[PDB]
Amino acid sequence: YDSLTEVEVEGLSYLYNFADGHAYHDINEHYVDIINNLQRYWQEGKDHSIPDMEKAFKNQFAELIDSSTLHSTNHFSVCPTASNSIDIVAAWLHKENKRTALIEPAFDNLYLLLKRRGVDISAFDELALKNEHQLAQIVSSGDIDALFLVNPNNPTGLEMTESEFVYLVEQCKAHNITILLDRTFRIYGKTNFDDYQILEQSGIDYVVIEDTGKTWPTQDLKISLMVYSEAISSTMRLLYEEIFLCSSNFALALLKQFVAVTAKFGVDATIKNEVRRRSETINDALAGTGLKVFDNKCQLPLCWIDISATGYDDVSFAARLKEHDIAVLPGRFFYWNSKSQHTQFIRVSLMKPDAEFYEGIGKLKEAVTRIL
């Protein structure tokens, strides 16, 4: 396999697809009114300018995450996909000649995009964010000028606490390190502190990437906030305009309501409760199988599964599941710098269509049982 995405595109043709983690579950009772009134959000995007709709969505999201710093900043761009933002950040890191340490494990495409754009990439252990001594040696090594992170991390669910985030920013400022912050799974995290305030008050250069595609199920009609410090804003804007003039005001109006509704009824009611129900299903299905579900860490709409006791490796166990019409992700690609040293893991995404998920999970337990 070339990439996780190739396994994902392969999984799009299977009856029970648990490969890609995109948000594709059914619209819950709370969001039904948004789809029932799609015309109002079509008309809202038509009646508001492109600059105004961009701030309307940004400040709506800033109210959701309770960050005044994000609400007051205007150094940002709106991309149709979060990968589009990682790519522009990749071009900026290469243009400014920044030796970037990339978190490991991470979704393979971040590494692939960083390499395609010609960035000097270094492997960076994810658990250094929770070990002060480990982070200090890498930051003081002088082999890197930028630090690319995913918080909370995919697929380990590792999440920095406020004291661990403040320690990381202060160390990067001391060594003039630029922080790249992939916050794709931010809403699933258990922490609740203003990371934008800690970033701007430090004065360091940073880029924070947001994303709706792993949270609200809008059929891959997504919006991705790209927020950056003032000192790098004009060059970031330049690189963004080489590709995009804007994103769609219609998409901005639709997702602005999804965020506003999540804020009104709360994240658990609209997001976290159904994720926890789907997490309990796979746990109860895979109890007593030799498959150990990774747990310590926040709960992502993904399930990291140790299959060491199964005797198979990640790829062949996934090949066995594919013969029973079940597509899963082999986990070695997430450890992009040490793939052969991590073959004891598969990943099962959760935010799939409801009927296909619960039936697919049942078929997964029957498939696991037959392979014994």
Ligand X SMILES: N=C(N)N/C=C/CC(=N)C(=O)O
Which parts of this chain interact with its own copies (CB under 8 A)?
Answer: 2-3, 5-6, 8-9, 12-13, 20, 22, 35-36, 38-39, 42, 45-46, 49-51, 80-81, 83-84, 87, 91, 109, 112-113, 116, 118, 218-222, 238-239, 241-251
Judged by beta carbon, residue 9 or residue 15, the one nearer ligand X is 9
Q: Out of 20, 182, 274, 314, which residue is the one contacting ligand X (CB under 6 A)?
A: 20
Q: Locate all alpha helices (DSSP H) within the chain, ordered by sequence.
A: 4-11, 32-36, 38-47, 50-64, 68-72, 82-95, 108-116, 132-141, 162-174, 195-202, 233-241, 249-265, 267, 273-285, 314-323, 354-370
Q: 7 contacts which partner out of its own copies, ligand X, none, CB within 5 to 8 A by kind?
A: none
334: exposed, middle or buried (Cβ count in 10 Å: 0-12, 13-18, 19+)? buried
Least distance in angstroms from the C-beta of 140 to its own copies: 32
Least distance in angstroms from the C-beta of 255 to its own copies: 12
Task: Tell me the number of residues near ligand X by CB under 6 A.
Answer: 13
Position 147, amino acid? L
Judged by beta carbon, residue 285 or residue 328, the one nearer ligand X is 328
Scanning 37-45, 163-171, 239-247, 284-292 for contacts with ligand X by CB under 6 A, the matching segment is 239-247
Contact flags string 274-313 toward ligand X, x per CB under 6 A: ----------------------------x-----------
39: how many CB neighbours lie within 10 A of its CB?
8
Q: Give exposure, 64-86, as e/b (b: 16+ Cβ within 10 Å).
A: bbebebbbebebbbbbbbbbbbb
Distance of alpha carbon 314 from the chain centroid: 22
Pairing mode, strands 121-125 and 100-104: parallel
- 109 near ligand X, rule: CB under 6 A: yes
Least distance in angstroms from the C-beta of 182 to its own copies: 15
Judged by beta carbon, residue 38 or residue 319, the one nearer its own copies is 38
Q: Give exposure, 122-159, as e/b (b: 16+ Cβ within 10 Å).
A: bbbebebbeeeeebeebbeeeebbbbbbbbbbbbbbbb
Residue 347 tokens read as 């990943």
Residue pair 328/321 in contact by the 8 Å Cβ criterion: yes
Q: 38 contacts which partner out of ligand X, its own copies, none, CB within 5 to 8 A by kind?
A: its own copies
- 355 near ligand X, rule: CB under 6 A: no
- Measure the CA–CA gap between 140 and 174, rounded to whole angstroms: 9
- 241 near ligand X, rule: CB under 6 A: yes
Q: Which residue is nearest to ligand X (CB)?
A: 21
By CB under 6 A, name the binding residues for ligand X.
Answer: 5, 8, 20-21, 83, 107, 109, 154, 241, 244-245, 302, 349
